[PDB]
Amino acid sequence: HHHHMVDEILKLKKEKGYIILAHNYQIPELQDIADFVGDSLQLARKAMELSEKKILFLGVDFMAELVKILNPDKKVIVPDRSATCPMANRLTPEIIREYREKFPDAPVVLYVNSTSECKTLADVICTSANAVEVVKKLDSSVVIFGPDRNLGEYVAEKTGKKVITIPENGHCPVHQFNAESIDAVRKKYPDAKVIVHPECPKPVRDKADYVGSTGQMEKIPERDPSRIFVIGTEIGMIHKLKKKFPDREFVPLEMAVCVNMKKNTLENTLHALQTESFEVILPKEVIEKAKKPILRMFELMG
Ligand SMILES: O=C(O)c1cccnc1C(=O)O
Ligand code: SF4
Numbered sequence: 001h002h003h004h005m006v007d008e009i010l011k012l013k014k015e016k017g018y019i020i021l022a023h024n025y026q027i028p029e030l031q032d033i034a035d036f037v038g039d040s041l042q043l044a045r046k047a048m049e050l051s052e053k054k055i056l057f058l059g060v061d062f063m064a065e066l067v068k069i070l071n072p073d074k075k076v077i078v079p080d081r082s083a084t085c086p087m088a089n090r091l092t093p094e095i096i097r098e099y100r101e102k103f104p105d106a107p108v109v110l111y112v113n114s115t116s117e118c119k120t121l122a123d124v125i126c127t128s129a130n131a132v133e134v135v136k137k138l139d140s141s142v143v144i145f146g147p148d149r150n151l152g153e154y155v156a157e158k159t160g161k162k163v164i165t166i167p168e169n170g171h172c173p174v175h176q177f178n179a180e181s182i183d184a185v186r187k188k189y190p191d192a193k194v195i196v197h198p199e200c201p202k203p204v205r206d207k208a209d210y211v212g213s214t215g216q217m218e219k220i221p222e223r224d225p226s227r228i229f230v231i232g233t234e235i236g237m238i239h240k241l242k243k244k245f246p247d248r249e250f251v252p253l254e255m256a257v258c259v260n261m262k263k264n265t266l267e268n269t270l271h272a273l274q275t276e277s278f279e280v281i282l283p284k285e286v287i288e289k290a291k292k293p294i295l296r297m298f299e300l301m302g
């Protein structure tokens with residue numbers, strides 16, 4: 001059944017010239033059939049290097065749209081067109097326009113987990129991995145930041161700059177661990193290092209040894225020799241990590257599952273390659289507009 005499905009997927013992939021890009025939060029079966037697994041930007045950038053012009057993207061809509069923005073002349077298909085980010089969808093163009101009005105000297109820094117429509121209105125895009133570098137390099141000492149309040153406050157702490165978060169209480173449900181969980185693993189594994197996402201609430205960040213994006217997580221065992229790592233993010237990272245460091249132990253801080261990331265399965269992936277749908281299409285003017293704050297991001301980096 002799974003061999004059945006996987007064999008067919010690996011068959012139709014080669015036969016129809018698709019590259020498969022999976023996000024770190026995908027079920028391990030989909031990570032294993034992917035050509036590259038990574039975070040949002042890493043996958044879009046990799047896609048820019050490829051000679052192939054057909055991409056099957058395994059993640060959520062905004063990420064597939066990011067791939068499309070940076071790779072306009074490539075066919076990008078997703079297996080579940082409803083896979084989306086509810087946090088991102090809470091920030092609106094009306095809210096952006098309201099805050100630019102109130103704070104005209106504050107650049108609009110937009111987190112990558114944001115709608116493409118929102119990107120068109122942003123001054124610069126950022127990721128969890130570069131948000132600190134990006135905001136530090138902007139001239140202004142005050143920024144408008146969205147849609148994640150936690151990442152925004154983390155950026156404030158690290159840059160010393162004033163960070164106006166939008167919308168009200170923008171948060172990712174997957175990363176709302178409680179600090180008690182850290183207290184518990186510390187007693188259970190006294191020599192374990194705890195790594196948590198910057199999207200986590202402040203108490204959780206303050207009690208961890210490391211705060212990092214998924215991409216940063218993947219690099220910490222290259223320099224930290226510890227046997228055991230407690231990982232405070234979506235469960236799919238545990239599989240990525242174990243694969244890259246089979247010599248260490250990776251313990252989820254808690255079971256945390258993104259419902260939308262899990263909408264992608266072997267079955268609907270197979271259907272995607274069969275039908276060559278669903279294609280990610282954006283208006284050309286949306287692409288042209290959203291590219292500006294993304295290119296601005298590359299420039300500051302680098
Ligand atoms: O940019 C991403 O892919 C991303 C999206 C949501 C949460 N975390 C990450 C990460 O890389 O750590
Ligand atoms: S894991 Fe969080 S930040 Fe990523 S798509 Fe799901 S709700 Fe959004």
Ligand SMILES: [Cl-]
Pocket residue numbers: 070071072073074
């Ligand atoms: Cl292209």
